[PDB]
Design a protein around this motif. Structure first.
Motif, PDB file in Angstrom:
ATOM      1  N   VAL A 176       0.992  -1.380  -0.171  1.00  0.00           N
ATOM      2  CA  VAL A 176       0.141   0.033   0.027  1.00  0.00           C
ATOM      3  C   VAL A 176       1.050   1.233   0.086  1.00  0.00           C
ATOM      4  CG1 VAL A 176      -2.012   1.110   1.339  1.00  0.00           C
ATOM      5  CG2 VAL A 176      -1.674  -1.326   1.268  1.00  0.00           C
ATOM      6  N   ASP A 177       0.746   2.230  -0.788  1.00  0.00           N
ATOM      7  CA  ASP A 177       1.119   3.501  -0.996  1.00  0.00           C
ATOM      8  C   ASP A 177       0.254   4.427  -1.459  1.00  0.00           C
ATOM      9  OD1 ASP A 177       3.213   5.773  -1.956  1.00  0.00           O
ATOM     10  OD2 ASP A 177       4.751   4.082  -0.866  1.00  0.00           O
ATOM     11  N   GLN A 178       0.374   5.669  -0.971  1.00  0.00           N
ATOM     12  CA  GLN A 178      -0.644   6.728  -1.295  1.00  0.00           C
ATOM     13  C   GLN A 178       0.095   7.608  -2.636  1.00  0.00           C
ATOM     14  OE1 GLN A 178      -0.618   9.161   2.258  1.00  0.00           O
ATOM     15  NE2 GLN A 178       1.182  10.237   1.582  1.00  0.00           N
ATOM     16  N   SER A 179       1.093   7.317  -2.712  1.00  0.00           N
ATOM     17  CA  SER A 179       2.043   7.929  -3.797  1.00  0.00           C
ATOM     18  C   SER A 179       1.898   7.491  -5.273  1.00  0.00           C
ATOM     19  CB  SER A 179       3.139   8.612  -3.366  1.00  0.00           C
ATOM     20  OG  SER A 179       4.163   8.382  -4.597  1.00  0.00           O
ATOM     21  N   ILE A 223      -3.240   4.148   3.689  1.00  0.00           N
ATOM     22  CA  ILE A 223      -3.644   2.866   4.491  1.00  0.00           C
ATOM     23  C   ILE A 223      -4.706   3.232   5.408  1.00  0.00           C
ATOM     24  CG2 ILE A 223      -2.104   3.537   6.549  1.00  0.00           C
ATOM     25  CD1 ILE A 223      -2.974   0.148   5.078  1.00  0.00           C
ATOM     26  N   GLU A 224      -5.112   4.354   5.689  1.00  0.00           N
ATOM     27  CA  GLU A 224      -6.142   4.601   6.721  1.00  0.00           C
ATOM     28  C   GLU A 224      -7.501   4.610   5.948  1.00  0.00           C
ATOM     29  OE1 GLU A 224      -2.705   6.911   8.668  1.00  0.00           O
ATOM     30  OE2 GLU A 224      -3.128   6.285   6.348  1.00  0.00           O
ATOM     31  N   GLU A 225      -7.541   4.752   4.406  1.00  0.00           N
ATOM     32  CA  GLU A 225      -8.669   4.715   3.665  1.00  0.00           C
ATOM     33  C   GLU A 225      -8.939   3.499   2.733  1.00  0.00           C
ATOM     34  OE1 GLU A 225      -7.653   8.760   2.016  1.00  0.00           O
ATOM     35  OE2 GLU A 225      -8.914   9.642   3.523  1.00  0.00           O
ATOM     36  N   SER A 257       7.156  -2.431   7.446  1.00  0.00           N
ATOM     37  CA  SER A 257       7.207  -0.887   7.044  1.00  0.00           C
ATOM     38  C   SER A 257       8.565  -0.496   7.281  1.00  0.00           C
ATOM     39  CB  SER A 257       6.336  -0.028   7.608  1.00  0.00           C
ATOM     40  OG  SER A 257       6.100   0.989   7.288  1.00  0.00           O
ATOM     41  N   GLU A 258       9.006   0.414   6.460  1.00  0.00           N
ATOM     42  CA  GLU A 258      10.171   1.340   6.697  1.00  0.00           C
ATOM     43  C   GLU A 258       9.531   2.739   7.081  1.00  0.00           C
ATOM     44  OE1 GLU A 258      11.699   4.231   6.942  1.00  0.00           O
ATOM     45  OE2 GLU A 258      13.267   4.074   5.036  1.00  0.00           O
ATOM     46  N   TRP A 259       9.330   3.104   8.328  1.00  0.00           N
ATOM     47  CA  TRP A 259       8.465   4.359   8.484  1.00  0.00           C
ATOM     48  C   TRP A 259       9.328   5.406   9.218  1.00  0.00           C
ATOM     49  CZ3 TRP A 259       9.278   5.072  13.619  1.00  0.00           C
ATOM     50  CH2 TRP A 259       9.242   3.868  14.562  1.00  0.00           C
ATOM     51  N   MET A 260      10.350   5.432   9.483  1.00  0.00           N
ATOM     52  CA  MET A 260      11.364   6.114  10.331  1.00  0.00           C
ATOM     53  C   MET A 260      11.666   7.550   9.670  1.00  0.00           C
ATOM     54  SD  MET A 260      11.798   2.571  10.568  1.00  0.00           S
ATOM     55  CE  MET A 260      13.377   2.351   9.958  1.00  0.00           C
ATOM     56  N   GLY A 261      11.701   8.199  10.446  1.00  0.00           N
ATOM     57  CA  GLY A 261      12.271   9.830   9.974  1.00  0.00           C
ATOM     58  C   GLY A 261      13.457  10.211  10.630  1.00  0.00           C
ATOM     59  N   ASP A 264       2.521   6.415  12.969  1.00  0.00           N
ATOM     60  CA  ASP A 264       1.060   6.678  13.128  1.00  0.00           C
ATOM     61  C   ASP A 264       0.120   5.849  12.184  1.00  0.00           C
ATOM     62  OD1 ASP A 264       1.983   8.690  10.954  1.00  0.00           O
ATOM     63  OD2 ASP A 264      -0.247   9.347  11.048  1.00  0.00           O
ATOM     64  N   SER A 265       0.367   5.914  10.924  1.00  0.00           N
ATOM     65  CA  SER A 265       0.007   4.983   9.654  1.00  0.00           C
ATOM     66  C   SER A 265       0.147   3.471  10.019  1.00  0.00           C
ATOM     67  CB  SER A 265       0.487   5.531   8.361  1.00  0.00           C
ATOM     68  OG  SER A 265      -0.039   6.886   8.165  1.00  0.00           O
ATOM     69  N   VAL A 266       1.229   3.366  10.633  1.00  0.00           N
ATOM     70  CA  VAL A 266       1.779   1.718  10.817  1.00  0.00           C
ATOM     71  C   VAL A 266       0.794   1.293  11.966  1.00  0.00           C
ATOM     72  CG1 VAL A 266       3.664   0.239  11.385  1.00  0.00           C
ATOM     73  CG2 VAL A 266       4.002   1.885   9.656  1.00  0.00           C
ATOM     74  N   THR A 301      24.197   6.235   7.288  1.00  0.00           N
ATOM     75  CA  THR A 301      22.784   6.034   6.630  1.00  0.00           C
ATOM     76  C   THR A 301      22.313   7.339   6.060  1.00  0.00           C
ATOM     77  OG1 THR A 301      21.284   6.520   8.681  1.00  0.00           O
ATOM     78  CG2 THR A 301      22.508   4.369   8.736  1.00  0.00           C
ATOM     79  N   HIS A 302      21.225   7.492   5.074  1.00  0.00           N
ATOM     80  CA  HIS A 302      20.597   8.639   4.642  1.00  0.00           C
ATOM     81  C   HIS A 302      19.713   9.402   5.957  1.00  0.00           C
ATOM     82  CE1 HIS A 302      16.923   6.025   4.977  1.00  0.00           C
ATOM     83  NE2 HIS A 302      16.167   7.292   4.631  1.00  0.00           N
ATOM     84  N   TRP A 303      19.770   8.777   7.105  1.00  0.00           N
ATOM     85  CA  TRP A 303      18.886   9.299   8.270  1.00  0.00           C
ATOM     86  C   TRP A 303      20.291  10.111   9.047  1.00  0.00           C
ATOM     87  CZ3 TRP A 303      17.316   3.938   7.763  1.00  0.00           C
ATOM     88  CH2 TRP A 303      16.149   3.903   7.546  1.00  0.00           C
TER      89      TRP A 303
HETATM   90  N1  LIG Z   1      13.515   6.857   5.645  1.00  0.00           N
HETATM   91  C1  LIG Z   1      12.322   7.344   5.541  1.00  0.00           C
HETATM   92  N2  LIG Z   1      11.154   6.551   5.635  1.00  0.00           N
HETATM   93  C2  LIG Z   1      10.110   7.333   6.118  1.00  0.00           C
HETATM   94  C3  LIG Z   1       8.792   7.260   5.374  1.00  0.00           C
HETATM   95  C4  LIG Z   1       9.190   7.928   4.058  1.00  0.00           C
HETATM   96  S1  LIG Z   1       7.307   7.936   3.111  1.00  0.00           S
HETATM   97  C5  LIG Z   1       7.857   6.365   2.132  1.00  0.00           C
HETATM   98  C6  LIG Z   1       6.513   5.885   1.356  1.00  0.00           C
HETATM   99  O1  LIG Z   1       5.459   5.877   2.300  1.00  0.00           O
HETATM  100  C7  LIG Z   1       4.320   6.337   1.655  1.00  0.00           C
HETATM  101  N3  LIG Z   1       3.343   6.813   2.473  1.00  0.00           N
HETATM  102  C8  LIG Z   1       3.258   7.690   3.583  1.00  0.00           C
HETATM  103  N4  LIG Z   1       2.553   7.798   4.229  1.00  0.00           N
HETATM  104  C9  LIG Z   1       1.260   6.912   3.693  1.00  0.00           C
HETATM  105  C10 LIG Z   1       0.104   6.584   4.245  1.00  0.00           C
HETATM  106  N5  LIG Z   1      -0.498   6.995   5.184  1.00  0.00           N
HETATM  107  N6  LIG Z   1      -0.344   5.575   3.472  1.00  0.00           N
HETATM  108  C11 LIG Z   1       0.004   5.200   2.579  1.00  0.00           C
HETATM  109  N7  LIG Z   1       1.435   5.230   2.014  1.00  0.00           N
HETATM  110  C12 LIG Z   1       2.003   6.476   2.680  1.00  0.00           C
HETATM  111  C13 LIG Z   1       4.731   7.551   0.754  1.00  0.00           C
HETATM  112  O2  LIG Z   1       4.078   7.806  -0.266  1.00  0.00           O
HETATM  113  C14 LIG Z   1       6.338   7.035   0.377  1.00  0.00           C
HETATM  114  O3  LIG Z   1       6.424   6.483  -1.025  1.00  0.00           O
HETATM  115  N8  LIG Z   1      12.443   8.709   5.587  1.00  0.00           N
HETATM  116  C15 LIG Z   1      13.676   9.645   5.753  1.00  0.00           C
HETATM  117  C16 LIG Z   1      14.178  10.146   4.108  1.00  0.00           C
HETATM  118  C17 LIG Z   1      13.732   9.207   3.043  1.00  0.00           C
HETATM  119  C18 LIG Z   1      14.087   9.771   1.904  1.00  0.00           C
HETATM  120  C19 LIG Z   1      15.184  10.883   1.840  1.00  0.00           C
HETATM  121  C20 LIG Z   1      15.543  11.357   3.004  1.00  0.00           C
HETATM  122  C21 LIG Z   1      15.042  11.040   3.993  1.00  0.00           C
END
Ligand SMILES: N=C(NCCCSC[C@H]1O[C@@H](n2cnc3c(N)ncnc32)[C@H](O)[C@@H]1O)NCc1ccccc1
Ligand SMILES: N=C(NCCCSC[C@H]1O[C@@H](n2cnc3c(N)ncnc32)[C@H](O)[C@@H]1O)NCc1ccccc1
Lengths: 303, 303
Positions: free
Chosen positions: B60-63, B89-91, B104-108, B118-120, B254-256
């Motif tokens: 699932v991805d919104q984009s 994922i909410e809809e 999931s990879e959800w981490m900022g 929150d979505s996970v 890492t990219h983080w």
């Molecule tokens: N490594 C990460 N990782 C965190 C998640 C990034 S978003 C990763 C993916 O998730 C999708 N997404 C976000 N909220 C969503 C939702 N509610 N329902 C469905 N799909 C959803 C978004 O379209 C994207 O493709 N971030 C740091 C980062 C990433 C890339 C470049 C720099 C920094």
């Protein structure tokens, strides 16, 4: 806008010291004159003009940054010479009819991406006194041929095998995106070719959309993988001390770096070959670059 | 969204190979199971799960990126195992009531900035079968003290003299902005201190807003100029082959990178001193970090 943009520009020594040198080494252009700084940001150019003996400097910026410029002009006790105005140059009311001199740093990646020149040309046409001057007054754009099969593979071939899975279809989203990056000068395989010359005194907005036939004189037998673009900036009119800087790969890097247009199909070239192509720039905020080379055409944009 | 985000994540070998290792080295977690990939992007995690023997994978991805994932799943002939759905994922409507496994990879940056947790957690609570598992299952956040008077001067003192002019007032806009960058491990002057532990099995959205008292055991007599934050990610539940990676400065970048909170007033510290402070995280999309240290408090955000 955000301070981070202004930090990056201020920390570009080539950019900021070229403007400083032009202004301090040509004070006759500024002595007792009325100066307009279009998109003044933190106001550094307005403070240079003030120090070179401007009677009056008008700094205009549409962004929040202008409130930081008001504090900065006060901190440096120049509020008696420099007056700052928030708004679009297109909308603001100036406390004068005409200015003697326009200065601006308006230049985008590949000169014209998200550039401010349209705003600067408006200022020229509305506010520039008969016989006045705008700076920088002359700009050029150049193309140069690149061989770098490793960087090409890093960006394109990458997508063929991603931890054992095919992502080949991703290549069609990547090729059309121009890359802003610093090129190793060692990877250049042609003499540069000028594709555009601008005098800001005579150019109109319509001239910024253009086509040019170009020839690249190949200097190395190699696989040609990209075309790089850059620009040169000149301060010439009425200068005893003329100033140029280049954003080309052979020169000290700037925050503009170089703009790189990747080829879908790299192709071999010979030392002494005259490689003929065509380029067109369309304002299609966002502008596009169409390249014809080796019987292939691709349109590139910038993210 | 844009391919550039997905390129950066895919090129992070620590990130992507940690997920690959966890999945391939623990196929019993995936064999004949129903798996939900929340924010699948290009779908690489869904394709790992498929290869480890998942009966069915829902990505699932919104984009827009989901349309590239549809082509990628077809290119790899996994369309019989992996079904992709565009939406939040909410809809979205899933073709099942419950899933066995959520990945999931959800981490900022600093774990929680522009994170997807929150979505996970929503997916967990709505779709996770009785006795099911979510991965990664355990996360920690740490602070570490930094001495780097040169990087501090580059960012702060810089503004006191800019080509001969005072821009001191700019410091008040810069201090509150957390910096995402790679720290030289040589600049660390304390043992790390854990400030937050999360099990994704039991945590709620409300637990992501928290306060922690911390002590930094100073290991070098120095000027303390910053506090750095990072996070550790663990795959533990039901693993024969447990997997951890750290985004800390002592570990492969890492990219983080790391998140750096600059001090307005650097202050001297002694080897063997117990430096006591407080930190609070508020979800005030955009979240803030309030640090009390050496009888000073500052709230930091991320640009
Ligand atoms: N490594 C990460 N990782 C965190 C998640 C990034 S978003 C990763 C993916 O998730 C999708 N997404 C976000 N909220 C969503 C939702 N509610 N329902 C469905 N799909 C959803 C978004 O379209 C994207 O493709 N971030 C740091 C980062 C990433 C890339 C470049 C720099 C920094
Ligand atoms: N070096 C440049 N340089 C191009 C101009 C950047 S904008 C530079 C400044 O001009 C202001 N501005 C823009 N359009 C305006 C208008 N119509 N009217 C009044 N003020 C206007 C804007 O708020 C900003 O502070 N760009 C490349 C770059 C810059 C920073 C970081 C990366 C790349």
């Amino acid at each position: 806008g955000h301070y981070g943009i202004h930090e990056e520009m201020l920390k570009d020594k080539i950019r900021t010291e070229s403007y400083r040198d032009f202004i301090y080494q040509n004070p006759h252009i500024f002595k007792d004159k009325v100066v307009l700084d279009v998109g003044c940001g933190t106001g550094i150019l307005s403070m240079f003009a003030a120090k070179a003996g401007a009677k009056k400097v008008l700094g205009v910026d549409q962004s929040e940054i202008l409130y930081q410029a008001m504090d900065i002009i006060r901190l440096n006790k120049l509020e008696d010479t420099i007056t700052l105005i928030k708004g679009k140059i297109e909308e603001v009311h100036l406390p004068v009819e005409k200015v003697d001199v326009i200065i601006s740093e308006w230049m985008g990646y590949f000169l014209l991406f998200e550039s401010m020149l349209d705003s600067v040309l408006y200022a020229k046409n509305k506010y520039l006194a008969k016989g006045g001057s705008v700076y920088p007054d002359i700009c050029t754009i150049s193309l140069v041929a690149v061989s770098d099969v490793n960087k090409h593979a890093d960006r394109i071939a990458f997508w063929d095998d991603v931890y054992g899975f095919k992502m080949s279809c991703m290549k069609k989203a990547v090729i059309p995106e121009a890359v802003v990056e610093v090129l190793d000068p060692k990877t250049l395989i042609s003499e540069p070719c000028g594709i555009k010359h601008i005098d800001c005194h005579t150019t109109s907005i319509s001239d910024l959309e253009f086509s040019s036939d170009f020839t690249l004189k190949i200097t190395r037998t190699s696989m040609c993988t990209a075309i790089a673009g850059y620009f040169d900036i000149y301060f010439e009119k009425n200068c005893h001390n003329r100033v140029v800087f280049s954003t080309g790969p052979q020169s000290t890097k700037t925050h503009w770096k170089q703009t790189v247009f990747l080829l879908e199909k790299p192709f071999s070239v010979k030392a002494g070959e005259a490689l003929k192509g065509k380029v067109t720039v369309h304002k299609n905020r966002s502008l596009t670059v169409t390249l014809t080379l080796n019987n292939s055409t691709q349109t590139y944009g910038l993210q």
